[PDB]
Amino acid sequence: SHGLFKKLGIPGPTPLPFLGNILSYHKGFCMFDMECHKKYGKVWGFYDGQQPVLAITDPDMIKTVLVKECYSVFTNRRPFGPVGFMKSAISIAEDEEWKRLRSLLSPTFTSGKLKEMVPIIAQYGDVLVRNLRREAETGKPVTLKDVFGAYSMDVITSTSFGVNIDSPQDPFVENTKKLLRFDFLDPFFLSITVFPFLIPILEVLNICVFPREVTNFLRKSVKRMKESVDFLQLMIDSQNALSDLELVAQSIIFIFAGYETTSSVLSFIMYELATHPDVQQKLQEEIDAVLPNKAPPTYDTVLQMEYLDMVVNETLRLFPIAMRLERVCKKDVEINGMFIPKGVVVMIPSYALHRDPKYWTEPEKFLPERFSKKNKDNIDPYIYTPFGSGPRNCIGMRFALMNMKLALIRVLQNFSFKPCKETQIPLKLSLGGLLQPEKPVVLKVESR
Amino acid sequence: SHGLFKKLGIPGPTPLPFLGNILSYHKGFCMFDMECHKKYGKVWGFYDGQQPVLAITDPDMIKTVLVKECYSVFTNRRPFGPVGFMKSAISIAEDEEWKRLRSLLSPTFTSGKLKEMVPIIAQYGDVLVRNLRREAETGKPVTLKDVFGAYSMDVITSTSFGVNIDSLNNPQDPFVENTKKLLRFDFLDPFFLSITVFPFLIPILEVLNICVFPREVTNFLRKSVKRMKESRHRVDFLQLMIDSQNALSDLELVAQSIIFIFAGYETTSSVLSFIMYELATHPDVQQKLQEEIDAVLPNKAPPTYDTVLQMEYLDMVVNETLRLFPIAMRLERVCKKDVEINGMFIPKGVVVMIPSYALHRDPKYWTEPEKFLPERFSKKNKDNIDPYIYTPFGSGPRNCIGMRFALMNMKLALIRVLQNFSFKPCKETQIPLKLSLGGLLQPEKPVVLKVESR
Ligand code: HEM
Ligand code: HEM
Ligand SMILES: CC(C)(C)OC(=O)N[C@H](CS[C@@H](Cc1ccccc1)C(=O)NCCCc1cccnc1)Cc1cccc2ccccc12
Ligand SMILES: CC(C)(C)OC(=O)N[C@H](CS[C@@H](Cc1ccccc1)C(=O)NCCCc1cccnc1)Cc1cccc2ccccc12
């Protein structure tokens, strides 16, 4: 099965038996994709154990996989297990079950439902400032991942359920951060890749990848938040063909994503603003112009800030927390002049494309001017895909971009951030699996 | 009310009662703006009847009006009427209605939606050649505005609606026949003359169902969109407005279509004729552009989305022509409330005007402004170009929404034309070119040139 890419004439690194190319992951997904992007050109193929993975970089071919032939051929991502009851999650469900859940949960983030969340999110924006001011009055470096994580839990549990949780040591944030950490050193998610044919054994044994008492803590809490329109209400009205188990599976996804993804990116943004004060000061000047006298940000004033979008768009380029986009070829096809057999996982190296010298001038440097309306037209929509593309992109794309900018406005209105010497400069990404910094981001907070 | 610029200490020509300074328009808006720029300096004021108009030329002050204080102060243009149902047009809408329509029509001109239009526009690029080849196999002048208007109509009728209405011509197409007479702001007409001089007659004409656009042309386009709205195609301009309508209505939907039909036809054909006049009067520039097209597209290769953006000299030719001939001529914004921008007070109701034609030919920003020199926009020299002095498509949140589309449509046409033909003057060609001393920016005599096959 390791002679597939040799048959199709597609270049790639020589795979070892059983393992394939998984030993090259010692530097991580990101560094492995960038090396292969320079060695083999635009399209290459490697093996994740016995699973052939075809990497594509052509925007037209990326468009065909994610958009055009999505509902027909490239509908599902790479199979993940053992999951148990989490198989009904929209990010794990396949084919027919995904179509019914994609349309069911789509009205959650419309232009109207998002405008309803602005007065609700604005409450915790003051608790974020009032908690930062306690560690700001005094000269104590703030772990932004921590402070940012508590704010991300209140927003997702009030805009999706309507429950106030975080005020410190919160059981939701404590369990959500332990929900899943794909560590290739951890001998569980590793052997799943090399030996994917033992997943059927663990499913009939009621084994799961997510901790038991972390799922139970989230399974009984949704049953607790269900006592008699938001994300929760949109599903109970369709239940009265959801069940008492698929409803919990979607809440686990929304709570983890709304917490972990929002907090890590905001820490990535504040690092770049602290390492580039000319960008931070210029961004602080725009916030004071659209919102004078520290005016509360509304729904419309957020979409007006051009430079605030140019900074978030540039950070998501340097740190695409998804790293890769994957679609499973469900039947033999020939897209854009290339035959792709059934069973091959088509992969879009999002991290490798976001730093391509063929597309970006000085890609390693932080320059938010890449997304200015003068230079925005030079960006291909299939090379810069921080939220994916096609009918199966990020469902909370418009929600996350608003929720992060709602925090960046209220924080920069009152505080400026400086390095703390103990700040990791330059920031080392975790050479592990998920995209994160090695050392937690720490900065000095100075009130204005 | 004629002593506003006296009080503010802002210079300008002394206005006459009722008329104001509209008698100085006998040479057109362009020559009036140039003379005032030389007489009074960076800032001057005048009156369109009883309407004070403040002209600014400072890039920092222009940036504040168009970009910084757009949503708060300078959101709407000077009121235009009577318009009837066309009041809901994006170019005419105001305040909240314009903000809702701009966001609704923004995804129409993305880099992905435009890249989908290249194969469709590539069809009419060949029809443009075969119609020119007939007039080129026989020695005889040829009207560009004519051939260019037929091509521009097919591009807008198919990229926005998906309807092919000009099957290889069909020269007497009813769309082109009606669209050309949709509006010609002629100052000799006592109608548009009295509209600007006496503006309180607009509410009288509105209740009289009178419209500046003739009824026969509006009806022809009104019943055509209802004819095009069956749809039983991909995501285009007609599908985006229907998907959000399935809130828009069956006449705001037509109002935006009439705007897109006019701009895609009149603006594209007029600028293309200005380009070919400059290429025929500058054979070295035309040869240099022809040498670049054949280098990027050898063997007369079909133009694609990426090959168009790669041509650097083609962009310099289109940009320099837009400098000498900004069809917009002026940029106007209504100051909705009293402000003090860049240390200058502006009262509420004053229309701030940016003389785009005058700034493009300012001898203080351009060396030899009247001369046609594409090298101004070379990457060696483009750094010395202020984006608020050269504004052919406007600036800020209310710039030209079809800028990237019109730039691609004109470039796609110029490529497929220069690939097969070269252009020479005809003696009957007006050299030098006289601009229309009337309202809109057009030549006096139509541009005629001799077409030779390669
Ligand atoms: C900076 C923040 C975020 C980024 C960069 C991001 C990125 C992504 C990406 C790349 C995908 C896959 C797209 C594809 O495969 O084509 C995805 C899917 C998804 N995202 Fe996000 N995401 C973010 C935040 C969120 C949030 C706040 C939620 C809240 C519910 C969320 C929920 C989801 C779900 C449910 C899916 C799977 C949808 C499906 O498979 O149909 N994400 N996201
Ligand atoms: C050479 C071709 C063109 C030029 C030079 C041009 C130029 C301009 C300018 C200067 C403005 C006003 C900007 C401002 O006031 O700041 C404008 C507005 C506009 N243009 Fe164009 N344009 C062209 C072609 C087109 C095309 C093909 C369309 C197709 C739909 C179009 C649609 C519009 C619309 C709808 C507006 C109103 C924008 C708004 O009110 O928000 N234009 N154009
Ligand atoms: C590539 C391969 C085969 C190794 O692993 C996958 O293919 N499995 C992905 C992850 S499995 C599961 C893990 C999890 C569940 C609950 C809590 C924490 C982790 C899962 O359901 N997580 C969806 C979480 C929602 C989210 C996350 C980030 C951004 N936005 C939304 C499948 C996957 C789903 C959605 C987005 C993804 C983005 C990048 C990479 C993979 C993605
Ligand atoms: C300047 C003032 C105060 C006297 O009257 C305005 O303020 N009204 C301008 C134009 S009146 C209206 C008339 C019309 C509509 C449809 C067909 C024919 C005529 C209008 O909306 N025509 C916008 C058409 C789209 C277009 C045109 C040219 C370039 N690109 C797009 C407002 C205005 C809008 C858009 C572009 C303009 C370009 C140059 C000058 C004015 C422009």
Numbering used by the authors:
A (entry chain B): 29 to 195, 199 to 259, 269 to 280, 289 to 496
B (entry chain A): 29 to 260, 267 to 280, 289 to 496
Question: What do the study's own words say?
Answer:
In humans, CYP3A4 is the major liver and intestinal P450 isoform with a large and malleable active site which can accommodate chemically diverse compounds. Crystal structures of the inhibitory complexes showed that the elongated compounds adopt a more relaxed conformation, which enables stronger N-pyridine ligation to the heme.
This analogue has outstandingly low Ks (0.007 μM) and inhibits CYP3A4 nearly as potently as the prior lead compounds (IC50 of 0.090 μM vs. 0.055–0.070 μM for 5b and 7d) and 1.5-fold stronger than ritonavir (Ks and IC50 of 0.019 and 0.130 μM, respectively). 3h (S, S), in turn, was the series V lead compound: KS and IC50 of 0.007 and 0.090 µM, respectively. Thus, the impact of the phenyl-to-naphthalene replacement in R2 depends on the side-group stereochemistry and is more pronounced when configuration is S/S. Superposition of 3e, 3f, 3h and 3i shows similar backbone curvatures, coinciding with R1–phenyls, and the R2-groups equally distant from the heme but not the pyridine moiety. Since 3f and 3h bind in a similar manner, it was not possible to deduce based on structural and experimental data why the latter analogue inhibits CYP3A4 twice as stronger. On the other hand, 5b (S, S), selectively chosen by CYP3A4 from racemic mixture, and the isosteric and equally potent 3h have notably distinct conformations: the 5b R1 inserts deeper in the P1 pocket, R2 orients vertically to the heme, and the end-moiety points away rather than toward the substrate channel. Even so, the new lead compound, 3h, was among the best CYP3A4 inhibitors designed to date with the highest binding affinity ever detected. Moreover, 3h and other lead compounds most effectively prevented the H2O2-induced degradation of the heme, confirming once again that strong heme ligation and the blockage of the active site are critical for potent inhibition.
